Amino acid sequence: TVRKNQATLTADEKRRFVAAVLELKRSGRYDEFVRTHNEFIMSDTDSGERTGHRSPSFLPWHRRFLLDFEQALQSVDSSVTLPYWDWSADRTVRASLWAPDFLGGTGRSTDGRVMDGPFAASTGNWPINVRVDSRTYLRRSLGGSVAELPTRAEVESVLAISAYDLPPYNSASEGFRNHLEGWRGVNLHNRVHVWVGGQMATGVSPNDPVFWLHHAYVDKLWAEWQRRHPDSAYVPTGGTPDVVDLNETMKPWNTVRPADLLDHTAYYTFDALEHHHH
């Protein structure tokens, strides 16, 4: 399994990815990923149990969720792997990611409805079923609620932080995880959700297929952080209430721990990942 930069996919790879995603939607499997994500993002809380977000396990949790999704895609087309979106590089509305042969573009200004690409509601192939309001069409407002996507310099400043995470292990933390998630500092992951807008900015954000490409890049940034800091590792390592410690298992699977997901190479590699250097 090699996860590739979306911008580098061939036309045949784009076609096969889109088709596998539409088949997971048609068969009813796609929407249960949306629902699981919704359940955790509405439950993960700074003052209580927190597993998928606002906590050290944000990164291993999303790594295992994306693996479950990639495995579902490979069950439809074994050649398909999850691509990633480097939003530091591919940062305008004219990026090929947003072309009608891949994810389609921004939403029209009246109702934010996406009007082109394979996921436009007019296709009849992308009903929004798991939702928080009456609208059943994909919406986006690229660059509408926040001006700019993160830059590489901003990404580098976060990758430079040595501590994986820090007490109190929530949205108030200093440390790498919370800066990558974006609750403190220049803001990487949260701001990208806001920049896309539409469902991507809400608690049913996997309704937009760009969800997976964004999270696959966030996942790559964790891998990059590990190469930059081979000496630094997941924390906490024991006895922390409400937080998943290194050797504790994670919901909803219960059969995997952060410790099992630190090394992505047991499951996939990237098209390119610098080895450790100075």
């Binding site: 919704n38 359940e39 993002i41 509405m42 439950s43 993960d44 809380t45 700074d46 003052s47 209580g48 109702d111 934010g112 939702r131 928080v132 309001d133 009456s134 609208r135 609620s145 926040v146 109190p168 929530n170 949205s171 108030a172 974006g182 609750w183 992951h189 949260n190 701001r191 959700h193 806001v194 900015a201 809400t202 608690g203 049913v204 954000s205």
Partner: protein, 78 residues
């Protein structure tokens, strides 16, 4: 932390209400036209909601207003 005060107003034609009280166990509840809007308090005392999940706002009334802004007239679903 103290619970925010309740509120009741009409904003962009919709009734928004807040009050101290599959999702966390809410310490504060917000409604848009009588339908509950899931909101959550962050460590720094700001708020988010399901309709605007990644963008903190200062208060539960701000989250209600941000939800009405984003909904553009659509009924909320429970």
């Amino acid at each position: 932390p103290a619970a925010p005060e309740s509120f009741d107003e009409v904003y962009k034609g919709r009734r928004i209400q807040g009050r101290p009280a599959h999702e966390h166990g809410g310490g504060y509840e917000v409604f848009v036209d009588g339908v509950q809007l899931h909101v959550m308090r962050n460590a720094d005392g700001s708020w988010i909601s399901v309709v605007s999940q990644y963008d903190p706002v200062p208060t539960p009334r701000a989250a209600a207003r941000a939800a009405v802004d984003e909904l553009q007239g659509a009924p909320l679903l429970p």
